[PDB]
Amino acid sequence: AQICDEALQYAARLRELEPGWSATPGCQLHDAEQLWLDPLRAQTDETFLQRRLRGDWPAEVGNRFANWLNRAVSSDSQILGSPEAAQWSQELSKELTMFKEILEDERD
Amino acid sequence: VTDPEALLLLPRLSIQNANAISSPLTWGFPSPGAFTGFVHALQRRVGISLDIELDGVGIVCHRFEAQISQPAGKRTKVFNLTRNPLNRDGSTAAIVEEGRAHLEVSLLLGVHGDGLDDHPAQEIARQVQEQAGAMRLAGGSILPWCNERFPAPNAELLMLGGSDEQRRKNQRRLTRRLLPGFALVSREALLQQHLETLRTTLPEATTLDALLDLCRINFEPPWQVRDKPGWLVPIPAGYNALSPLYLPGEVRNARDRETPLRFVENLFGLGEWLSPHRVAALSDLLWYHHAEPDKGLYRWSTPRFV
Amino acid sequence: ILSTASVLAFERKLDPSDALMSAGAWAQRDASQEWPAVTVREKSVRGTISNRLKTKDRDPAKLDASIQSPNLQTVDVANLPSDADTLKVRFTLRVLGGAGTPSACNDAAYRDKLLQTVATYVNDQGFAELARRYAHNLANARFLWRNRVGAEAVEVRINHIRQGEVARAWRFDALAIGLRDFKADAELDALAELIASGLSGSGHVLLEVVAFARIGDGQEVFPSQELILDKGDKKGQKSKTLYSVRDAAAIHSQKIGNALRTIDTWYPDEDGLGPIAVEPYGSVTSQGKAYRQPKQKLDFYTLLDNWVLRDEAPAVEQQHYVIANLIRGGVFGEA
Amino acid sequence: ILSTASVLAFERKLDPSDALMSAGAWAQRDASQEWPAVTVREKSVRGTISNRLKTKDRDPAKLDASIQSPNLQTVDVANLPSDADTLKVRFTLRVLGGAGTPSACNDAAYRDKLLQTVATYVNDQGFAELARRYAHNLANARFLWRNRVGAEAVEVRINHIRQGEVARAWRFDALAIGLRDFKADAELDALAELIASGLSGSGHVLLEVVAFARIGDGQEVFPSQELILDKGDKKGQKSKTLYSVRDAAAIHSQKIGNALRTIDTWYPDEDGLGPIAVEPYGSVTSQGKAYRQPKQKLDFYTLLDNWVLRDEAPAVEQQHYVIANLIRGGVFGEA
Amino acid sequence: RGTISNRLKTKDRDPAKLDASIQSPNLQTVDVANLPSDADTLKVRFTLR
């Protein structure tokens, strides 16, 4: 919960403080994120990317964020062949559920 | 104590020299008594005219910068002071150490009364922002946001919602509006149950030892730090009586001669800086007063937190 | 006591090349050396959604708003030219020999015991069944994976390349030789004896395998597929990239190696499915099922640790499978 | 008392280069200077699981669920082109000379005794056996490490380079010259006298060693493999990366130097295994076994401490091994 | 990739320990500077005041 919430605050202060997400164009900027550039692609481009962020509703960042927490855990098979992986997966699923519904309504 | 009918949001107020000395034992963010006294000043100055009752503050603290400096060769810190005037003789005055800090807080003032129906929401929001623009929060002036990108306006959120979904929607809309900060709540039941477990381990331990144990980063040998849930801080949770209550024109050199004075002393409870969407209802996390003046125990807390 | 070695690294025998695919017309496969290569090109695809909904997005307004914004991809496609109806898939195959010697082994006693085990195998029965089944998977064009499944006529020409040229050329009809029957032909026995001589170390074998397929004028051919970077947008998404070596579509070498290894008809499940590829814990990726699970004693590791350590020699069929795994190579041994 | 010096840093004689590998057709090896270089390119592999399971992961549902989610890698591969069957591996080998003189030594008496011991060896029997075996490891293309094991015909051309050009040109057949028997030929003796004159300090030796290998059309060549960072995702895993100097595959210089040093047929185990590389505590990391363990008195260190300090001069083969280690170099001495 | 070739301090002279230590060889990424394949002259150029 604290890691997900610090991710939400990093996205918040990066999307609010710096206009650097729309500072320069390039070839690779990890454009599949589209969460740390909320006012950057809508307050300037009116129909270009705002129509690709409100109808698409980019919330697939949580699936890439789950890879970070799978990197946070090791390859311990004493939990992977036990019910601790089930409890870990259920708490991860409910926490990415609340992270998804917080990430779903960036449009309002 | 009572539930707010609406939840006003004063937006990010820039405070330039707040009081870093919150209490005799705590430095850092100013005491929540400053914010509850601020909302009572707002009620005393425009709350009576709009026929509303501004009670409760949610303290969010987007930015904090203490005017401190770590001396060379010391782990601890010391306060950057000011230069007071000289005496009548020309010598430097005896220095008194006042900690200054720069803040950026946004306040959730719980507004309930018969004035939400008379005036629009935006009018009473704008009038309490104009009244807060000529005030001070903990001893520090509220900076008034001139010539910046865009002025941060208010939103008086009428908490009386037609549905649960619209209510949760506007709570999420307000939490996204006060997001980069950290809401401050009073978690005193956690301090009492930590005192209970501490007294289970070693007897005759008092709750100042439990407060200090929740404060420090203590190490345990097999070396592993004992983990702490959240950002637990020591905060002054009000006052406590030392003298009996004196009559108005009885004590010498009081502020006014019409208000009963009582010599008091702080009560350091436990607070917890948590993020605004860990609460799931912003009509909690507001700081009210609890006096009980016959006993002393003039205290402030966040009732209805958990 | 002869515990197993902690490392066992068998180098891959039966090394194929990247199956370079070109295009041309039938009845001039005899002059099929200057045929133009099948070039991998890009094309734009737009799809409406067709995957299963997860019972929360089954609202009519939600589904209609989702089909109002269809996703755009630009896929790599490899098609034959419009005036060419034959796909020449041409690779070269070395058969190395020395199937039992591992490239890495800690225990000298276990290595000598495994060498003695493979030596008694080859002495009792040489590489005759394995080479016959490898020659079948060369003869029927199983290395044409999906380029075979609707072809009118497939013909495989297998040339034994000596010092600089062909020494013995073969010519098979890959549809009469089925994908599931390992029968005996007359030319297939000569090719099996050639792969037998290459596997036993008694001769050098370099085969050039050239397979033609009447797919049709301008149809789609199916080279192997690369993976993508997933760094860009969702309109120029580039969802499919095909393999190309130098402006020329190609199947990967391990796909050809997997189709040459489809000789395993000895797994404990039904033989009505046909052969699978020789793998330890013999597993298929399409069907998602792991035949020769280690709970039955028919996986490669239990068979090898019974054949080498405790001298419990299996049947001739499961030891054919074990020697096919040693030909396949791998990283065997624990940590 | 003549204690051992605290530091001993012997510089490296027999300096080879990065073995650049290019490609082309056989029978035009005489015009093989403008041959195109073998480029290291990427390809994506998709494997199942084939490692040994640890008796707790042997559940059938867990094994099927593990083969349903396969590991996608991308690997660096280097093949010959489809119209080329010859791998030209070219490096230069510079033999310096002065094998006994260390570059760092504290005890000056130990330095003088080591120089007297090595000069006693050279005057008694010069660099003749060592140079013959180094000339064999240039002659049989052992520096072609895995590019040799299935090669049809290997030919090594060694050009001694004087002032700017060839002074003496050799041309060997590396498959007739065995990988384990150090016989005596006519040209190999001339190369042995040249390396003898190089190691003795009586001349400057710069041998451009070019070796061709009939692998096949489009077959895989095996350059040296680097180590990977492992900082990224597990679908673009990049499991194998290959060495390449500048858009051209290459074998590492120390790999060539190790393959030239496989002259030690004097280790106390059986000589039926053949030569291993000259190392102190003479070890083969493929076989995981260290011959010349210091329990027996046949490692480099106890032989050097008996030869130099207490003057128990070992046998002829063992002092050949000792001077081969001094040619190899290293950081000898305590801390 | 290099196996162990420094001296042993007589406690590491067990043969199983030695083979176990050469089974896990140390890896490095060393910085090297070589001439190109079409270059046989190294030009070192500096100034001296």
Short mmCIF file of C-alpha atoms in Angstrom, two decimals, chain C residues 26 29 87 139-144 147-157 172-176 210-215:
data_model
loop_
_atom_site.label_atom_id
_atom_site.label_comp_id
_atom_site.label_asym_id
_atom_site.label_seq_id
_atom_site.Cartn_x
_atom_site.Cartn_y
_atom_site.Cartn_z
CA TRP C 26 6.54 -24.67 -60.36
CA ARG C 29 12.26 -25.94 -59.65
CA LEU C 87 7.86 -21.51 -51.97
CA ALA C 139 11.59 -36.30 -46.24
CA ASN C 140 8.14 -35.12 -45.27
CA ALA C 141 8.49 -31.36 -45.01
CA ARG C 142 7.64 -30.94 -41.36
CA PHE C 143 10.09 -28.04 -41.21
CA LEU C 144 7.57 -26.26 -43.40
CA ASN C 147 3.55 -23.39 -45.21
CA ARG C 148 2.69 -27.09 -45.64
CA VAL C 149 -0.83 -27.30 -44.21
CA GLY C 150 -2.68 -26.38 -47.39
CA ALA C 151 -0.07 -26.87 -50.07
CA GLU C 152 -1.09 -28.73 -53.20
CA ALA C 153 2.23 -30.49 -53.75
CA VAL C 154 5.33 -30.44 -51.57
CA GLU C 155 8.64 -31.75 -52.88
CA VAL C 156 11.84 -32.00 -50.83
CA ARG C 157 15.21 -32.25 -52.55
CA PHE C 172 10.95 -36.89 -52.07
CA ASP C 173 7.23 -36.23 -52.35
CA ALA C 174 6.45 -34.89 -48.91
CA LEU C 175 2.69 -35.51 -49.01
CA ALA C 176 2.86 -39.24 -49.72
CA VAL C 210 15.39 -27.69 -50.43
CA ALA C 211 11.62 -27.85 -50.11
CA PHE C 212 9.10 -26.51 -52.60
CA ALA C 213 5.44 -25.92 -51.80
CA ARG C 214 2.59 -25.10 -54.18
CA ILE C 215 0.87 -22.59 -51.93
#
